[PDB]
Design a protein around this ligand. Structure first.
Ligand SMILES: [Mg+2]
Length: 137
RNA sequence: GUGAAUACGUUCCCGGGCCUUGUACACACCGCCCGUCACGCCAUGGGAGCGGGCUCUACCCGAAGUCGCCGGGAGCCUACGGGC
């Protein structure tokens, strides 16, 4: 009874963890499986993460990509069993949670609102490489 | 066979001839010619609007690119002053 919410978690065997961390205000790419008509592809889709809707298992994130002169957005679930690889590319300062203004105001004016959150860079650059020596010995 | 009147004269009506005049007339005034209207054809201006081409003013976004800066709380060659 008093486990009412543990029940769902128990139902969460479909849980992954090789996902690297990130937070709204930075760009990233995924790699996805699409029924490519006859077969299936690894559709590398790189963009900016916009929104993050957290709810334990069914936590979703929305990625936006400007392709061929068209502002697109793409919504993915975190534990989706379709993410082969997924690797960040850059990180940036937040100042706000969501950011439904990159919709309207998409240009170079976002190359100055993003800015390089170099703090987490060193953080990423730390365990990425300096901890490799903590494997090869 | 017998056997008259008057023309003073050309002002005026008619015909013809000649001179001059005019013309747009010339199978020659039964001529020539004008404009509306009616019919068909032809381009055409105006004209509620329709379709394009070109140019200009202002503002927004802005690929590749040279040039000025930072090149730093990283990447990298180090030729460790530096260069990508
Ligand atoms: Mg006309």
């Amino acid at each position: 009874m008093n486990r009412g919410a543990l029940i769902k978690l128990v139902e969460s065997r479909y849980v992954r963890t090789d996902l690297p961390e990130f937070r709204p205000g930075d760009t990233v790419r995924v790699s996805y499986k699409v029924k490519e008509g006859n077969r299936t592809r690894i559709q590398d889709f790189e963009g900016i993460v916009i929104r993050i809707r957290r709810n334990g298992f069914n936590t979703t994130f929305t990625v936006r990509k400007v392709s061929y002169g068209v502002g697109v957005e793409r919504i993915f679930p975190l534990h989706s069993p379709l993410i082969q690889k997924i690797d960040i590319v850059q990180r940036g300062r937040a100042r706000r949670a969501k950011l439904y203004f990159i919709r309207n105001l998409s240009d170079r004016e976002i190359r100055r609102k993003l800015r390089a959150d170099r703090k987490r860079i060193d953080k990423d650059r730390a365990a990425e490489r300096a901890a490799k020596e903590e494997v090869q010995k």
